[PDB]
C-alpha cells in the first residue's frame, strides 16, 4: 500500500483512519473472546493505521 | 474402508440391509401378491407412502415388516418412560452391564409383543381371521428377523444398528420417484424451474446444516503443564468443540416413531371418529400437527441429548487431566457452566431441526407441487450423510 493512500485527499484519509480504527476495535474484541483464529490481522491493521497517520502529518507538514 | 476390519463390517451391513430389502417384498398372507399389489397403489390414503420408507417398501409392496423397526422404537421410548416414573426400573437401569442389557431385553420383549399388537390393530381394523392370522404371523416373523438383523449391525457391522436400519430403509426407497422425474426431464412435462429450485434447496439446506456444523461453539480450555523430566515445557489452549446437535441421529427416528404411533393406532380403524379426529389432526398439512410435532421433537432431542453427556463426568475428567475453563471454578461450577451452555445450544439445534421439518410443507401448500421432500426425509438423509462422514473421519484418524 502507501502509494494508494498518497493518492487520496485529506478528508478521505480521515475517513480511512476511522474505518481502520473500527476494524482494530472489532478485531481485538474478537481476540479477547477467543473467537479470532487469525491473529496476524492485528499487526496488519495496527501498522496500516500508522501509515495513514504518517501521511496525514506529511500532508499538513507540506 | 481399505482395511479389511471395517470392510467386512460394511459388507455385513450391506448384506443385512439387502436381506432387509429381500424381506421387504414378501406377501403378508400365503400368496396375496397381486391383490396386495393392487391395494398398495393406495385406493385410500396417499400419506401411507411415508409408512413405506421406514419399512423398506412394505406399505409400498407386500412385506413381512410393515412398519419396519418402528415398533421397537415405540417400545424403546415406553420403557424409557417407565424407567423414570417407576423406581424399580430406575434401579435396574443404573445397574451397569447386565442391568442395562436386561432393560434392553425387556425393551426387545416389549417390542415383539407390540408388533403382535399392531398386527392385531391392522388386521382387525384396516384390511378386512385367516388373513388376520397370516398378517400377525408374517408381521412378527418380520419384526423379529429385523430386530435381530439390527442388533447384528451394532456388533459385527458398522456404527449403530437401528440407526442404519431406518437410515438405509428410507435411503433405499428413493430411486423410482426420481427415475420418473428424470424420464420426464427429457420431455418437460413438469417444469424444470420448480424441480431445480427444489434441487438447489435440498443442497443449500444440507449445506446450511453442515455450515452450522462447520463453525462450532468452542469453549476455550487451558492446560498448564511442565513435566518433571525438565524436558516438556507446555502452556496449551484446547477448544472443547460443542456441536449444535449432539448425535442427532437417534432422536430423529424416535420422534418419527412417535409421529407414526398415533397414525398407526388411529388411522387403521377409521370407525373411531375421535381417532380419525387426531389422525386427521396429525396429517402434516395442518399447523396443529406441527405444534404437537414441535413439542415432540424438542422433548425427544432435549431428553436424549441430556441422556448422552454427563457434564459432571466431563468436568471431573477435565479436572483430572489438569485442565480448567479460565475464570470458572473447577468441579461443580464447570459442570453447571458446560451443562447450561450445552442446553442453550441443543435447544437451538432442535429448533432449527423442527424448522427444516415444518417449512417444506408450507412451501408445498403455497406452491403447486405436492413425501420424501416433505421435511422429515430430507433431514434424516442429511443425518445419514453427517453420521457416515463423522464415523468415517473418526476411524480415518485411527487409520
Amino acid at each position: 500500500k502507501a502509494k494508494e493512500l498518497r493518492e487520496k485527499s485529506v478528508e478521505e484519509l480521515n475517513t480511512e483512519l476511522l474505518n481502520l480504527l473500527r476494524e482494530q476495535f472489532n478485531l481485538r474484541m474478537q481476540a479477547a473472546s477467543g473467537q479470532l483464529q487469525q491473529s496476524h490481522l492485528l499487526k496488519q491493521v495496527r501498522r496500516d493505521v500508522a501509515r495513514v497517520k504518517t501521511l496525514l502529518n506529511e500532508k499538513a507538514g507540506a | 474402508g481399505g482395511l479389511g476390519e471395517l470392510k467386512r463390517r460394511l459388507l455385513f451391513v450391506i448384506g443385512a440391509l439387502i436381506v432387509f430389502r429381500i424381506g421387504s417384498f414378501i406377501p403378508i398372507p400365503g400368496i396375496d401378491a397381486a391383490v396386495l399389489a393392487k391395494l398398495l397403489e393406495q385406493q385410500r390414503g396417499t400419506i401411507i407412502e411415508m409408512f413405506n420408507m421406514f419399512s423398506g417398501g412394505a406399505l409400498s409392496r407386500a412385506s413381512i415388516f410393515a412398519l419396519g423397526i418402528m415398533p421397537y422404537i415405540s417400545a424403546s421410548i415406553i420403557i424409557q418412560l417407565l424407567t423414570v416414573v417407576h423406581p424399580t426400573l430406575a434401579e435396574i437401569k443404573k445397574e451397569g452391564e447386565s442391568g442395562r442389557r436386561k432393560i434392553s431385553q425387556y425393551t426387545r420383549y416389549g417390542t415383539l409383543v407390540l408388533a403382535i399388537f399392531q398386527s392385531i390393530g391392522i388386521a382387525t381394523g384396516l384390511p378386512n381371521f385367516a388373513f388376520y392370522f397370516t398378517a400377525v404371523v408374517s408381521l412378527v416373523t418380520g419384526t423379529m428377523f429385523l430386530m435381530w438383523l439390527g442388533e447384528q449391525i451394532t456388533e459385527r457391522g458398522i456404527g449403530n444398528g437401528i440407526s442404519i436400519i431406518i437410515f438405509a430403509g428410507i435411503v433405499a426407497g428413493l430411486p423410482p420417484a426420481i427415475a420418473h422425474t428424470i424420464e420426464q426431464a427429457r420431455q418437460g412435462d413438469l417444469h424444470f424451474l420448480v424441480l431445480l429450485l427444489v434441487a438447489v434447496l435440498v443442497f443449500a439446506v444440507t449445506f446450511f446444516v453442515v455450515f452450522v456444523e462447520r463453525g462450532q461453539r468452542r469453549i476455550v480450555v487451558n492446560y498448564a503443564k511442565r513435566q518433571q523430566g525438565r524436558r516438556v515445557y507446555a502452556a496449551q489452549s484446547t477448544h472443547l468443540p460443542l456441536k449444535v446437535n449432539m448425535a442427532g441421529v437417534i432422536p430423529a427416528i424416535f420422534a418419527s416413531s412417535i409421529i407414526l404411533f398415533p397414525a398407526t393406532i388411529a388411522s387403521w380403524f377409521g370407525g373411531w371418529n375421535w381417532l380419525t379426529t387426531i389422525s386427521l389432526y396429525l396429517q402434516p398439512g395442518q399447523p396443529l400437527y406441527v405444534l404437537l410435532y414441535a413439542s415432540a421433537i424438542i422433548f425427544f432431542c432435549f431428553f436424549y441429548t441430556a441422556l448422552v453427556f454427563n457434564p459432571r463426568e466431563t468436568a471431573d475428567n477435565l479436572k483430572k487431566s489438569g485442565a480448567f475453563v479460565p475464570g470458572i471454578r473447577p468441579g461443580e461450577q464447570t459442570a453447571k457452566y458446560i451443562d447450561k451452555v450445552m442446553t442453550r445450544l441443543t435447544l437451538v439445534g432442535a429448533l432449527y431441526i423442527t424448522f427444516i421439518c415444518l417449512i417444506p410443507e408450507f412451501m408445498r401448500d403455497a406452491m403447486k407441487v405436492p413425501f420424501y421432500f416433505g421435511g422429515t426425509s430430507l433431514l434424516i438423509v442429511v443425518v445419514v450423510i453427517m453420521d457416515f462422514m463423522a464415523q468415517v473421519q473418526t476411524l480415518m484418524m485411527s487409520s
Binding site: - | P175, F203, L351
Partner: protein, 59 residues
Amino acid sequence: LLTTKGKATVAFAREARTEVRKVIWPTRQETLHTTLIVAAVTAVMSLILWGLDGILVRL
C-alpha cells in the same frame, strides 16, 4: 403459570441470541468445502442405489 412460561421462554430466547453471538458468520471457502463434500457423498450413495436398483427394476 402461562406468564411465567412466557418469561421463561423469553429467558431461553435470550440464551438463544447469546449462543447466536458465538455463531460463525458467512464464509464462502468453508461453503465450497461443505458443498463439495456432501455433493460427493450423496453422489456415492446415489450411484450405489442406481447401480443396484436400475438393473434390478430393468429385470
